Amino acid sequence: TELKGALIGCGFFAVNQMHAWKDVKGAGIAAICDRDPKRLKLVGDQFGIERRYGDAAALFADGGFDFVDIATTVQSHRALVEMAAAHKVPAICQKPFAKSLSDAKAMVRTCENADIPLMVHENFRWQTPIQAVKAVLESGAIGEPFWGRFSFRSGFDVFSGQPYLAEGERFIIEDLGIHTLDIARFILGDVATLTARTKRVNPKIKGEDVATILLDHQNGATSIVDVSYATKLGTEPFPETLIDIDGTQGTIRLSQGYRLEVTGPNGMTISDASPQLLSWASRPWHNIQESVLAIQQHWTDRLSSGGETSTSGADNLKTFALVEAAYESAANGRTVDIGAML
Amino acid sequence: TELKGALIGCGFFAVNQMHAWKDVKGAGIAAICDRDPKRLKLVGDQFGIERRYGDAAALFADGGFDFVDIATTVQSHRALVEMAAAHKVPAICQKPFAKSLSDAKAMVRTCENADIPLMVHENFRWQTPIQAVKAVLESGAIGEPFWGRFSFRSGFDVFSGQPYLAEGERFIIEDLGIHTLDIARFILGDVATLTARTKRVNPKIKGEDVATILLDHQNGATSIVDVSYATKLGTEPFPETLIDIDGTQGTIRLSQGYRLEVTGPNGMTISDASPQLLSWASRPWHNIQESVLAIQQHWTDRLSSGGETSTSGADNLKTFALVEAAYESAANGRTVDIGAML
Ligand SMILES: NC(=O)c1ccc[n+]([C@@H]2O[C@H](COP(=O)([O-])OP(=O)(O)OC[C@H]3O[C@@H](n4cnc5c(N)ncnc54)[C@H](O)[C@@H]3O)[C@@H](O)[C@H]2O)c1
Ligand SMILES: NC(=O)c1ccc[n+]([C@@H]2O[C@H](COP(=O)([O-])OP(=O)(O)OC[C@H]3O[C@@H](n4cnc5c(N)ncnc54)[C@H](O)[C@@H]3O)[C@@H](O)[C@H]2O)c1
Numbered sequence A, B: 001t002e003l004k005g006a007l008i009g010c011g012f013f014a015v016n017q018m019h020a021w022k023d024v025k026g027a028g029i030a031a032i033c034d035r036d037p038k039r040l041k042l043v044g045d046q047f048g049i050e051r052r053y054g055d056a057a058a059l060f061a062d063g064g065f066d067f068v069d070i071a072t073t074v075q076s077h078r079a080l081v082e083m084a085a086a087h088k089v090p091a092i093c094q095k096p097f098a099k100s101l102s103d104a105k106a107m108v109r110t111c112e113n114a115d116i117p118l119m120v121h122e123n124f125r126w127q128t129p130i131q132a133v134k135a136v137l138e139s140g141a142i143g144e145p146f147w148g149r150f151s152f153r154s155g156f157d158v159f160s161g162q163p164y165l166a167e168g169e170r171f172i173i174e175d176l177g178i179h180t181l182d183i184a185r186f187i188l189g190d191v192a193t194l195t196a197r198t199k200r201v202n203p204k205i206k207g208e209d210v211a212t213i214l215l216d217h218q219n220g221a222t223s224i225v226d227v228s229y230a231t232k233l234g235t236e237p238f239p240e241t242l243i244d245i246d247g248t249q250g251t252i253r254l255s256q257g258y259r260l261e262v263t264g265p266n267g268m269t270i271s272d273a274s275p276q277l278l279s280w281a282s283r284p285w286h287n288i289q290e291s292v293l294a295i296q297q298h299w300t301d302r303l304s305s306g307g308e309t310s311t312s313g314a315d316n317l318k319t320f321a322l323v324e325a326a327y328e329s330a331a332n333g334r335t336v337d338i339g340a341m342l
């Protein structure tokens, strides 16, 4: 049962997804789609794809694939997911999931009514270091977690790879903070209330590139999500997410260079949580690139057995509501009940 | 020529102040005062102070000192500052300044009508590393500051040397966070608005021992004041305050071991901001103990020069409001307007 997938949106990051599909056991890419025949041709030759489509409606009409991997930008997401549901094709969707929390819910509802899986490609929680933090806290090595911090502070030029980032009136939460919020959820549970502040420091972008978010977790823990693309440090940590967790029995400290300090009753342990460097990977992206293979293999496995995925459309609504809360909060000075939004 | 001071409250921390007055150029301690006959004996004998009093009223009646140094616990701060003003004797008063913001304002007003200097003994500000960070930022090394973190996370047994801390129904913001909020003002200026979460983790005490505070500075900067005494680290940082600052041209990062790191236009510097170990000083408190010499020497200088001190009673109202806002916000769950309190 070698699953045959189709990829819609042969863009900058989709090249990572295509490399990873070769490595994925039990699945591979049978067709591709793109409105930009330059990208369709370039990706098509690179990964040796016979079937190529100028529009996604033709692709879905011909079929011959078990699942669809949507790697377009947010504009196309809702329709391509709706197309996928009408044709009963299981769907993976990049982030941001949708333009609003409304769009995301209808996208979750359409796929449930159709009885098809819907994973959101949210690969930050699928990195080795992040999993190691979860693994540690899951064991009980530091007792009940009560306080956390999640940090992604960088001066790396993401705007060359992704020019659209500088164009929007929204930027860092929508794009990057969405991940860091997903990790806060993934480590400390769902969020009851959220308060946020944003700022634009960089004068060559239309959007906020610094954000600081304070999270009240349902489980009792407080956490800090702080992100910036205007932080100029001695060593560029990009694209690492630094994490501190305190609990009743101990502390976790995931720091720059993937050094992982855990301290408990028995004592301290220092562990190297560095990612693997895959054959097609490229520094410093190798961290994220590995997590593409992790989440795509996870999709394939959960699909082949029947189960729900980790970042299912259903799950991802609870991450996406923090993003939407954050912007709301940023324009009011005021806390947002997350429970009321869902 | 040397100024004559009188010390009211010969407890635990007053012993550091006494040593420092010895070292301070231009001042000494002519008289000590304490309500406990055994403390009055111990400190009096250790520092060879002839004049000893069981009550401040008798002390103030006899007079013969140019300033008073109040190092009692918070309950008797108002009465002693009010006596000081009634006898026109310049006053140094410990933290916490008063029991409420109401009391503090009234104490500041009393000292202005009597027309005497009033300085809150708020010494964290005067630590070598904390001054070093101030100097970097003033230099303009990193441009305009836009974001800060001020962190004091320890598992140290402070309860032995000060039993009242466990007893208080309010703990960490009143005791330690007052320092970290003062530092946030010192580095990034006054606060427009404030929002705070707290919890008690230690089963043994009655007060909150973890606080996470998010500050909106008038100059546009945002910061996180996070403090804890229920934090179990593999190397105990007590009593260091770890500071992170981001500005438009660079960053400051003061990490454990008084390691100051500045990144700017002209590369990146690393310096050692650790304090002197004074003859009478003793690790790991040499941090705080040096600042006592600094602030008291600063007071003498300023009382001689007729200049208003750095932690003047009136300035310290803008710190104290943040403590009173943080408790209020922790209960509310709602952002507090600072300017309205003042
Ligand atoms: N960590 C991650 O998982 C990660 C990393 C980078 C980017 N992303 C996300 O991936 C998405 C794409 O990022 P990118 O930088 O590759 O953008 P991109 O512009 O390079 O890629 C989008 C491609 O999709 C095509 N496209 C758009 N609408 C289409 C439609 N209706 N049918 C067919 N093709 C269509 C465009 O021609 C373009 O080539 C973004 O939403 C971004 O948030 C995720
Ligand atoms: N870094 C610092 O600046 C620092 C460090 C520790 C404590 N403190 C502050 O110092 C203050 C005292 O701390 P401590 O640990 O020395 O407490 P303590 O109980 O050891 O000392 C206070 C002393 O004052 C005496 N006293 C109280 N009321 C009096 C009155 N009306 N007249 C005469 N004597 C009186 C008591 O008998 C006691 O001996 C606290 O308010 C605390 O916030 C500051």
Ligand SMILES: [Mg+2]
Residues within 6 Å of the ligand: A021, A022, A023, A024, A025, A026, A027, A028
């Ligand atoms: Mg394959």
Ligand SMILES: [Mg+2]
Residues within 6 Å of the ligand: B021, B022, B023, B024, B025, B026, B027, B028, B029
């Ligand atoms: Mg002297």
